[PDB]
């Protein structure tokens, strides 16, 4: 049946962090061996199940919630981490059982004037339960109430952007991760 990964990896438009699209894939035959080829330096960090061992094994459902974050935060989306993405944007349950594909994508993610179509929520009152997604744009009173539906001393607007340009360091270079989080699907 040839499970569709041609979408989640090769789709033109690239999801941002907070709006991470958890594309559920199922009822089809996949091949994880297809993936080990692109990123000359992938990331495939398989938490839970061995990358090669995975092919002849399977579970009920799969979620490849791809998006884009800064290269220096590729290390950040790993279970048990406690960073900015981990606390407020995306997290992995401690008993994570998936594979975290992550590769450098300099092209199509770097305009000479900068691709600012990506944002990241740098502020939140409380941390995230595993796999929470929050599109809430409401203004973050990191500091006092008053009414807060617009302000600007500091209330703060919890969803900044990034800056992506080829001259940046590799850490600043944007990377697209594809976190897979796992009996109708296996090959």
């Amino acid at each position: 049946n040839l499970c569709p990964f041609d979408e989640v990896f090769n789709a033109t438009r690239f999801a941002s962090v907070y709006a991470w699209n958890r594309k559920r894939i199922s009822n089809c035959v996949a091949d994880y061996s297809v993936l080990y080829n692109l990123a000359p330096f992938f990331t495939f960090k398989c938490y839970g199940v061995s990358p090669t061992k995975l092919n002849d094994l399977c579970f009920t459902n799969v979620y490849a919630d791809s998006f884009v974050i800064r290269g220096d935060e590729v290390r950040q989306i790993a279970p048990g981490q406690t960073g900015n993405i981990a606390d407020y944007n995306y997290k992995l349950p401690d008993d994570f059982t998936g594979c975290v594909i992550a590769w450098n994508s300099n092209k199509l993610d770097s305009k000479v004037s900068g691709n600012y179509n990506y944002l990241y929520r740098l502020f939140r009152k409380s941390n995230l339960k595993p796999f929470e997604r929050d599109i809430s744009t409401e203004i973050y009173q990191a500091g006092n109430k008053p009414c807060n539906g617009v302000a600007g001393f500091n209330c703060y607007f919890p969803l900044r952007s990034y800056s992506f340009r080829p001259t940046y360091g590799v850490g600043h270079q944007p990377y697209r991760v594809v976190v897979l989080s796992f009996a109708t699907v296996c090959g």
Partner: antibody, heavy 127, light 108 residues
Framework: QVQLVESGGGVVQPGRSLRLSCAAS????????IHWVRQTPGKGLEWVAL????????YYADSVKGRFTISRDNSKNTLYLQMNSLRVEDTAVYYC??????????????????????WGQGTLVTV | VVMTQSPLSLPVTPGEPASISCRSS???????????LDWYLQKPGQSPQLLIY???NRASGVPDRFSGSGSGTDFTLKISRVEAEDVGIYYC?????????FGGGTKV
């Protein structure tokens, strides 16, 4: 709440062996590594050996590389290290140290390196 | 690899900042732009605790005054505000490959 408590060490005799066990809990002690590091007094800490979170594969220090034996013990969240054939210059407290990246089985570009986030309390062993 | 710290003793009267340096036999900065020395302290009569990791970004639960600078081979720990809680020997593990030649060790 990450906890590495260890016991088993003590006064021993040159030429024989001993069994060190570093019980763990608080975290899922089936996910990520534990290292061993020893410091003999009057000398800086010397790294001993590690093990990848299920016993996948082992490395030992160039000063040992084989007379030391480490063996994980899952299903009860305990670690076992077995020394063999101690020498004179091995009297040293042995620290079992948890390293704070929850181990992956793949190949990352970004490695984050070994770093022993939470440690034990040591077991003075003397030859 | 072998690590050599400096100074293995920096008795620093309280307040003013103290710097501790380590040398590397090879450039630890790997092609991904990460440095790998790790500063480990240990107060007298206690287990060592993580103080910095990967050279730059410290472990959660460590004050801001334990900033550590990075290079290709000459890394440095900055203790902006030294007081009683900061006393204890430090170390610089190189975290690049087995074996981890755990550094010499300074003093406070």
């Amino acid at each position: 709440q990450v906890q590495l408590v260890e016991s088993g060490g003590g006064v021993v005799q040159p030429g024989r062996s001993l069994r060190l066990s570093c019980a763990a809990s608080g975290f899922i002690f089936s996910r990520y590594d534990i290292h061993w590091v020893r410091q003999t007094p009057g000398k800086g800490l010397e790294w001993v050996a590690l093990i990848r979170y299920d016993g996948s594969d082992k490395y030992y220090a160039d000063s040992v590389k084989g007379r030391f034996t480490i063996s994980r013990d899952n299903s009860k969240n305990t670690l076992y290290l077995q020394m063999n054939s101690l020498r004179v210059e091995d009297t040293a407290v042995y620290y079992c140290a948890k390293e704070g990246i929850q181990g992956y089985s793949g190949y990352d570009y970004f490695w984050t390196g070994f770093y022993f986030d939470y440690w034990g309390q040591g077991t003075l062993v003397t030859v | 690899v072998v690590m050599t710290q400096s100074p293995l003793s920096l008795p620093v009267t309280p307040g003013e900042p103290a710097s501790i340096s380590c040398r590397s036999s090879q450039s630890l900065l790997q092609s991904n732009g990460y440095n790998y020395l790790d500063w480990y302290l240990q107060k007298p009569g206690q287990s060592p605790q993580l103080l910095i990791y990967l050279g730059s970004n410290r472990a959660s639960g460590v004050p801001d005054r334990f900033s550590g600078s990075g290079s290709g081979t000459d890394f440095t720990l900055k203790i902006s505000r030294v007081e009683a809680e900061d006393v204890g020997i430090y170390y610089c593990m190189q975290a690049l490959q087995t074996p981890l030649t755990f550094g010499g060790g300074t003093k406070v």
